[PDB]
C-alpha cells in the first residue's frame, strides 16, 4: 500500500531528468494522497436465529453497500487492502447455501476496490498524459456502476429483489469490472506508462475478438486513451 | 436515528455549514459524525471539507487589494464556478416533500470531481501573484482528461484577461 | 382484440375483409351488433418441430 | 418566514430579523420552527442586507464638510447604480408566491451575483467616511478603486464614475 | 365544484412544463400532438412502440413532399 | 376516450390529411402498437433523467442540463402525471442534436426476470 | 401554509406570554388607505391622526409579515 | 460447463476460437440464470 509514495518519488525525479530541457512540472498537494477521498472500502442481530427468508432479505442490502465500497453489516471488507486485491469477512453463522452464493457475487466488489485506486493514482502528473486519459475513461464507466447499484436499491425497497434476481442483474457489470480491474493491475505490474499502455490496450483489443461485449470496452478505452498520444 | 434524518444534514454539509448530527472533529481535518450509513455519510461529507477550503480562499484573497489584478480575477472565477454548484444544490433542497440515490453518491459524483481540481489548483497557486499566478494556472492545463483540462482552460481565460 | 390475446384471429379479421374491394352498409351491421353473441392445435407454439426454427431461449410465458 | 427575509433584504427592520447599528441585521433566536442549521444562512443574507441598510443610511444622509456637491453627485450616483438592487428584490416575490416548495437556498443561487459587489463597494464610502474626501478629489478615489480585478466591481464604480464626471464636465463647461 | 378548476389548472401547468422539456430536447412536437402522446402514456402503453411509429409516420409524411 | 381513437387522432396530426384516407397507416400503427403494449422494461426514473442530462451535456449545452433538473422538479411537484416515465422516455427517444457505443453504460433492467 | 408567519409564533406559549389582541387586515386595504392619505385626504382607519402627526394605528396585523415590521413600513409612509 | 469456462480462460494458451466458443457457452448461462430467477419468483409453486 505505502510504496506508491516512493514510486511517485522515483517517477517525479525521472520526469525531471527527462525534462532536463525544461522546468516546473505541476504536482498535487499531499492531502490529495493522504485523505481517504475517493478510495473504496474501509451490535447487529443474532443472524443464526434470523430465519432463512429474512436472512437473505438482510444480506441483500449489504451487497448494495459492498458493491460501492462500504463495510456492510455482515460481509464486511478486510484490512490489508494492499497487494493487488481485496478479501471480505462474511460471517461463520450465516447459512452455508447463502454464503456460497455471497462468495459468487463479491468478485464484482473485490474488483471495484482496485479500480477506484487506479482512477486516483494514474491521474497525477507523474504518469504522463495517456495514463490520465485512460484513468478518466475508466472514471466514466464507474459512474454507470453507481447508476446501476442505485437502480437495484429502488427495486429492493419495493420488496421486489432477491439473490437469484440480483445474480441475474449484475452479470454485465461483473463482466466489465473483471475487464477493468485486469486492465488496471496489468498496468501496475507492467509498470510502464504512455506509449506502452497504449500498446497494452490495443493488444487486448485483439485478445477479445470473440466476446464482443468486452470487445467494445477495449475499443472504447483505447479510442479514449489514444487522444493525448 | 434514521436514514431520513441523515440525508437532511447531508444537504447543508455540501455547503460548508454544520448539520444537526454531522458537526466536525476539531477543525479542517475531517467531518466525523455524531452504521454503514455512517460510512456513506462520511464519504459524502468530504465534499463539505472541499467547499470550506475553496470558499474561505475567495473570501480573503478578494477584499485584499494587495493581492493584485490576477489574484482577484482568479477569486472571481472560483466564485462563478461555485455559484453554479449552488444551483445544483438548490434543487436538492427542494425534492424534500423518495430521494436517496445511495444517499446521493451518483448526484454529487460529477461536481465532486470538479470540487477536486480547484481545491488543488488553489493550493498549487497559493503564495504566487501577478503574471506568475497566470503560470500556476497554466501548469494544470497539461493533463489528459478533457474534464480537468477544459475546466482549467476556462479559468486560463478569465485569468488571462 | 389484438391487446387481449388472440392476435392471429385479429389478423384473420382484417385479411378476411381486405378482400371485399371487388358492402360497407353490410359491415356496419356486424360492428354495431358485435358484442351481442352467446357467451386443439399442436403446431401452435412448439419449438421442437418445423424446419429452420431460429434461436430464442426460454419463453416461459408460452 | 420568507416575506420577512425579503423585506429585510430590503430595508425595514422587523422581529425575526433583528437589527443593531453595530452588528447589522442579526437573526439570533433559537427557533423551534426551522431546521437548526438555518440562522447562519440568514446572518449571511443579513450581511448583504446590511450593506443595503448601512449602505442606504449614507444615501439619505445627503441630497461644507462631507456635504459637498461632488459627494452628492457620487451619492446620487450610488442611487443610479444601486437601483438594480432594489429592482432585483421586487422580482424575488414572483417565484415564491407561485411555487409552494422553493426553500431559501434558492435565494442564494440568485443574489450571490451581488456578493462580489456590495462589500467591495462598501469600502469606497467607508473610506470616504473614515477619511474625509472633498471636491473633484472624490473623482479620484472612484477611479483608483475602478482599477480592480473583479469585473462586477470594475463596472459598478465605472457607472458611478461617469455620472459624477457629469458634474465635472458641466462645471468645466461654464468655466470654458 | 371548485375542484373542476383547481385540477384543470394543474393540467394547464403540467402541460406547458412538458412543452419546455420537449423544446430543450429540440423535438418536433407541437402543443397538440404532445397532449395526445401524454394522454396515451397515462393509460399504460409501451413508449418504445409509439416512439418508433411517430418517426415512421413522419418519414411517410416528409417523403411525399 | 380509448386508445384506438387516440391513436387515430395521432395519425391525423402527424399526417397532413383526413381520417378516412390514412387508414392504411392506422392499419400499420395498429399492427405495431398492438402486442407491444405491456411494459417491456422495468420502469423507474433516476435512470431516464440521467440518460437525458448526459445527452445535453454531450452537446455542450450544459445549462439546459441544469434547467432540466428543475423542470423535472416542477413536473413532479404538481401530482397530476402518475406515469411520468413514459413521456420522458418518449421525448428522450424523439430528441435531436441541434449541432455510438451505447452498450457499456447503465441501461433499463429487463423485467423478463419476473413472472405474472 | 408558508404564508402564515408568526401565526405559529405560538411557541411563545412555551416560555411566558400574554396574548395580544389584534385585527387582521388585507394588505390591499392598507394600500387603499395610503393611496387616500397620499392623495391628501383625512382620518383613514389605518394612518390614524394623533395631533396633526399621522400615526400607524397600533395592533394592526397581516400574516406573511409580523406586527412591528408592518408598523415600521407605515411609519415611513406616515412621515411622507 | 462452469468447470469448462473457468479452466479455459485461465489457459491463456487457448486459441482465439477457444475463447469465442467459450464466450458463447456462458452467454447461454445468462438464459439459464434468467429462467432460474423466474423460478425463484414463483416461490410464494410446486
From Swiss-Prot, chain A:
Reported effect, residue 139 to C: In CDCBM15; uncertain significance
Tissue expression notes: Ubiquitously expressed.
Effect after changing residue 175 to C: In CDCBM15; uncertain significance
Localisation: Cytoplasm, Cytoskeleton, Microtubule organizing center, Centrosome
Quaternary structure and partners: Component of the gamma-tubulin ring complex (gTuRC) consisting of TUBGCP2, TUBGCP3, TUBGCP4, TUBGCP5 and TUBGCP6 and gamma-tubulin TUBG1 or TUBG2. TUBGCP2, TUBGCP3, TUBGCP4, TUBGCP5 and TUBGCP6 assemble in a 5:5:2:1:1 stoichiometry; each is associated with a gamma-tubulin, thereby arranging 14 gamma-tubulins in a helical manner. Gamma-tubulin at the first position is blocked by TUBGCP3 at the last position, allowing 13 protafilaments to grow into a microtubule.
Disease: Cortical dysplasia, complex, with other brain malformations 15: An autosomal recessive disorder characterized by global developmental delay, variably impaired intellectual development, speech delay, facial dysmorphism, microcephaly, and varying degrees of cortical malformations including pachygyria, thin corpus callosum and subcortical band heterotopia. Most patients have generalized seizures.
Family that this chain belongs to: Belongs to the TUBGCP family.
Identification of the protein by name: Gamma-tubulin complex component 2
Source organism: Homo sapiens (Human)
Lineage per the UniProt record: Eukaryota, Metazoa, Chordata, Craniata, Vertebrata
Covered range of the whole protein: 150 to 387 of 902
UniProtKB/Swiss-Prot annotation, chain B:
Free-text tissue specificity from the UniProt record: Ubiquitously expressed.
Subcellular location: Cytoplasm, Cytoskeleton, Microtubule organizing center, Centrosome
Origin superkingdom: Eukaryota
Assigned protein family: Belongs to the TUBGCP family.
Quaternary state and interactors: Component of the gamma-tubulin ring complex (gTuRC) consisting of TUBGCP2, TUBGCP3, TUBGCP4, TUBGCP5 and TUBGCP6 and gamma-tubulin TUBG1 or TUBG2. TUBGCP2, TUBGCP3, TUBGCP4, TUBGCP5 and TUBGCP6 assemble in a 5:5:2:1:1 stoichiometry; each is associated with a gamma-tubulin, thereby arranging 14 gamma-tubulins in a helical manner. Gamma-tubulin at the first position is blocked by TUBGCP3 at the last position, allowing 13 protafilaments to grow into a microtubule.
Function according to Swiss-Prot or TrEMBL: Component of the gamma-tubulin ring complex (gTuRC) which mediates microtubule nucleation. The gTuRC regulates the minus-end nucleation of alpha-beta tubulin heterodimers that grow into microtubule protafilaments, a critical step in centrosome duplication and spindle formation.
Name of the featured protein: Gamma-tubulin complex component 3
Gene it is expressed from: TUBGCP3
Part of the full-length chain shown: 245 to 424 of 907
UniProtKB/Swiss-Prot annotation, chain D:
Highest taxon of the lineage: Eukaryota
Tissue-level expression: Ubiquitously expressed.
Subcellular location: Cytoplasm, Cytoskeleton, Microtubule organizing center, Centrosome
Subunit architecture: Component of the gamma-tubulin ring complex (gTuRC) consisting of TUBGCP2, TUBGCP3, TUBGCP4, TUBGCP5 and TUBGCP6 and gamma-tubulin TUBG1 or TUBG2. TUBGCP2, TUBGCP3, TUBGCP4, TUBGCP5 and TUBGCP6 assemble in a 5:5:2:1:1 stoichiometry; each is associated with a gamma-tubulin, thereby arranging 14 gamma-tubulins in a helical manner. Gamma-tubulin at the first position is blocked by TUBGCP3 at the last position, allowing 13 protafilaments to grow into a microtubule.
UniProt disease annotation: Microcephaly and chorioretinopathy, autosomal recessive, 3: A disorder characterized by congenital microcephaly and chorioretinal dysplasia associated with poor vision and nystagmus. Variable ocular anomalies include microphthalmia, retinal folding, retinal detachment, optic nerve hypoplasia, absence of retinal vessels, round areas of chorioretinal atrophy, and attenuated electroretinogram. Most patients have mild developmental delay and mild learning difficulties.
Family in the record: Belongs to the TUBGCP family.
Protein name per UniProt: Gamma-tubulin complex component 4
Native organism taxonomy: Eukaryota, Metazoa, Chordata, Craniata, Vertebrata
Protein encoded by which gene: TUBGCP4
Swiss-Prot record, chain E:
Assembly mode: Associates with the gamma-tubulin ring complex (gTuRC) consisting of TUBGCP2, TUBGCP3, TUBGCP4, TUBGCP5 and TUBGCP6 and gamma-tubulin TUBG1 or TUBG2; within the complex, interacts with TUBGCP3 and TUBGCP6 to form a luminal bridge with actin that stabilizes the initial structure during complex assembly. Interacts with TUBG1.
Single GO cellular component term: interphase microtubule organizing center
Keywords for this protein: Acetylation, Cytoplasm, Cytoskeleton
Name the UniProt record assigns to this protein: Mitotic-spindle organizing protein 1
Source species, domain of life: Eukaryota
Compartments reported by the entry: Cytoplasm, Cytoskeleton, Microtubule organizing center, Centrosome; Cytoplasm, Cytoskeleton, Spindle
GO BP field: gamma-tubulin complex localization; microtubule nucleation by interphase microtubule organizing center; mitotic spindle assembly
Protein's UniProt keywords contain Lipid metabolism: no
Role played: Required for the recruitment and the assembly of the gamma-tubulin ring complex (gTuRC) at the centrosome. The gTuRC regulates the minus-end nucleation of alpha-beta tubulin heterodimers that grow into microtubule protafilaments, a critical step in centrosome duplication and spindle formation.
Disulfide-linked positions: none
Gene: MZT1
Family statement drawn from the similarity comment of this UniProt entry: Belongs to the MOZART1 family.
Amino acid at each position: 500500500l505505502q510504496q506508491s509514495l516512493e514510486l511517485k518519488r522515483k517517477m517525479l525525479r525521472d520526469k525531471q531528468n527527462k525534462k532536463n530541457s525544461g522546468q516546473h512540472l505541476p504536482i498535487f498537494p499531499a492531502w490529495v494522497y493522504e485523505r481517504p477521498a475517493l478510495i473504496g472500502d474501509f451490535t447487529a442481530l443474532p443472524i443464526g436465529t434470523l430465519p432463512l427468508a429474512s436472512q437473505e432479505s438482510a444480506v441483500v442490502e449489504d451487497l448494495l453497500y459492498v458493491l460501492v465500497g462500504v463495510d456492510g453489516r455482515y460481509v464486511s471488507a478486510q484490512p490489508l487492502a494492499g497487494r493487488q486485491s481485496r478479501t471480505f469477512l462474511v460471517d461463520p453463522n450465516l447459512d452455508l447455501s447463502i454464503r456460497e452464493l455471497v462468495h459468487r457475487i463479491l468478485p464484482v466488489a473485490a474488483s471495484y476496490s482496485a479500480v477506484t485506486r487506479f482512477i486516483e493514482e494514474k491521474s497525477s502528473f507523474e504518469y504522463g498524459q495517456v495514463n490520465h486519459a485512460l484513468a478518466a475513461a475508466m472514471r466514466t464507466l464507474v459512474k454507470e456502476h453507481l447508476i446501476l447499484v442505485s437502480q437495484l436499491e429502488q427495486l429492493h425497497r419495493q420488496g421486489l429483489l432477491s439473490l437469484q434476481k440480483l445474480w441475474f442483474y449484475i452479470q454485465p457489470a461483473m463482466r466489465t469490472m473483471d475487464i477493468l480491474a485486469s486492465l488496471a493491475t496489468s498496468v501496475d505490474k507492467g509498470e510502464c506508462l504512455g506509449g506502452s499502455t497504449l500498446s497494452l490496450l490495443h493488444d487486448r483489443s485483439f485478445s477479445y475478438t470473440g466476446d464482443s461485449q468486452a470487445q467494445e470496452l477495449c475499443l472504447y478505452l483505447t479510442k479514449a486513451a489514444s487522444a493525448p498520444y | 436515528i434514521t436514514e431520513a434524518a441523515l440525508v437532511r444534514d447531508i444537504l447543508y454539509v455540501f455547503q460548508g455549514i454544520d448539520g444537526k448530527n454531522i458537526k466536525m472533529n476539531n477543525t479542517e481535518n475531517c467531518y466525523k459524525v455524531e452504521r454503514s450509513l455512517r460510512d456513506t455519510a462520511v464519504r459524502l461529507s468530504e465534499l463539505g471539507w472541499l467547499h470550506n477550503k475553496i470558499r474561505r480562499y475567495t473570501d480573503q484573497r478578494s477584499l485584499d487589494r494587495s493581492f493584485g489584478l490576477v489574484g482577484q480575477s482568479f477569486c472571481a472565477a472560483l466564485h462563478q464556478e461555485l455559484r453554479e454548484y449552488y444551483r445544483l444544490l438548490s434543487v436538492l433542497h427542494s425534492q424534500l416533500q423518495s430521494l436517496t440515490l445511495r444517499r446521493l453518491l451518483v448526484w454529487t459524483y460529477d461536481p465532486k470531481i470538479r470540487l477536486k481540481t480547484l481545491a488543488a489548483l488553489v493550493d498549487h497557486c497559493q503564495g504566487r501573484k501577478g503574471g506568475e499566478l497566470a503560470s500556476a494556472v497554466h501548469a494544470y492545463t497539461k493533463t489528459g482528461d478533457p474534464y480537468m483540462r477544459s475546466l482549467v482552460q476556462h479559468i486560463l481565460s478569465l485569468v488571462s484577461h | 382484440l389484438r391487446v387481449g390475446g388472440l392476435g392471429p384471429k385479429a389478423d384473420r379479421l382484417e385479411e378476411l375483409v381486405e378482400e371485399l374491394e371487388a358492402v360497407g352498409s353490410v359491415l356496419d351491421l356486424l360492428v354495431q351488433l358485435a358484442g351481442s353473441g352467446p357467451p386443439r392445435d399442436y403446431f401452435l407454439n412448439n419449438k421442437h418441430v418445423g424446419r429452420n426454427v431460429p434461436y430464442s431461449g426460454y419463453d416461459c410465458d408460452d | 418566514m420568507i416575506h420577512e427575509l425579503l423585506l429585510a433584504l430590503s430595508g425595514y427592520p422587523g422581529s425575526i430579523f433583528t437589527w443593531n447599528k453595530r452588528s447589522g441585521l442579526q437573526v439570533s433566536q433559537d427557533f423551534p420552527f426551522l431546521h437548526p442549521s438555518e440562522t447562519s444562512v440568514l446572518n449571511r443574507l443579513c450581511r448583504l442586507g446590511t450593506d443595503y441598510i448601512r449602505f442606504t443610511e449614507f444615501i439619505e444622509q445627503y441630497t461644507g464638510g462631507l456635504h459637498g456637491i461632488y459627494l452628492r453627485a457620487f451619492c446620487t450616483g450610488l442611487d443610479s447604480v444601486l437601483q438594480p438592487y432594489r429592482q432585483a428584490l421586487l422580482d424575488l416575490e414572483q417565484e415564491f408566491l407561485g411555487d409552494p416548495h422553493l426553500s431559501i437556498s434558492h435565494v442564494n443561487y440568485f443574489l450571490d451575483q451581488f456578493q462580489l459587489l456590495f462589500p467591495s463597494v462598501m469600502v469606497v464610502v467607508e473610506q470616504i467616511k473614515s477619511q474625509k474626501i472633498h471636491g473633484c478629489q472624490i473623482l479620484e478615489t472612484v477611479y483608483k478603486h475602478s482599477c480592480g480585478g473583479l469585473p462586477p466591481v470594475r463596472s459598478a464604480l465605472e457607472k458611478i464614475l461617469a455620472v459624477c464626471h457629469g458634474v465635472m464636465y458641466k462645471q468645466l463647461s461654464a468655466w470654458m | 365544484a371548485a375542484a373542476a378548476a383547481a385540477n384543470l389548472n394543474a393540467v394547464r401547468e403540467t402541460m406547458d412544463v412538458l412543452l419546455e422539456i420537449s423544446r430543450i430536447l429540440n423535438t418536433g412536437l407541437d402543443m397538440e400532438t404532445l397532449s395526445i402522446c401524454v394522454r396515451l402514456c397515462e393509460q399504460g402503453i409501451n413508449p418504445e412502440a409509439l416512439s418508433s411509429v411517430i418517426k415512421e409516420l413522419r418519414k411517410a409524411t416528409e417523403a411525399l413532399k | 376516450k380509448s386508445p384506438n381513437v387516440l391513436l387515430q387522432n395521432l395519425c391525423c396530426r402527424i399526417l397532413g390529411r383526413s381520417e378516412a384516407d390514412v387508414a392504411q397507416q392506422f392499419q400499420y400503427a395498429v399492427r405495431v402498437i398492438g402486442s407491444n403494449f405491456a411494459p417491456t422494461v422495468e420502469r423507474d426514473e433516476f435512470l431516464v433523467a440521467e440518460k437525458i442530462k448526459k445527452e445535453l451535456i454531450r452537446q455542450r449545452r450544459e445549462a439546459d442540463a441544469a434547467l432540466f433538473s428543475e423542470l423535472h422538479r416542477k413536473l413532479h411537484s404538481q401530482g397530476v402525471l402518475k406515469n411520468k416515465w413514459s413521456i420522458l422516455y418518449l421525448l428522450l427517444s424523439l430528441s435531436e442534436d441541434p449541432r455510438s457505443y451505447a452498450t457499456l453504460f447503465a441501461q433499463a433492467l429487463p423485467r423478463d426476470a419476473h413472472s405474472t | 401554509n408558508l404564508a402564515a408567519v408568526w401565526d405559529q409564533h405560538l411557541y411563545s406559549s412555551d416560555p411566558l406570554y400574554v396574548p395580544d389582541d389584534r385585527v387582521l387586515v388585507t394588505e390591499t386595504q392598507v394600500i387603499r388607505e395610503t393611496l387616500w392619505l397620499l392623495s391628501g385626504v383625512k382620518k383613514l382607519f389605518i394612518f390614524q391622526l394623533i395631533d396633526g402627526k399621522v400615526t400607524v394605528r397600533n395592533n394592526i396585523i397581516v400574516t406573511h409579515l409580523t406586527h412591528s415590521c408592518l408598523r415600521s413600513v407605515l411609519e415611513q409612509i406616515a412621515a411622507y
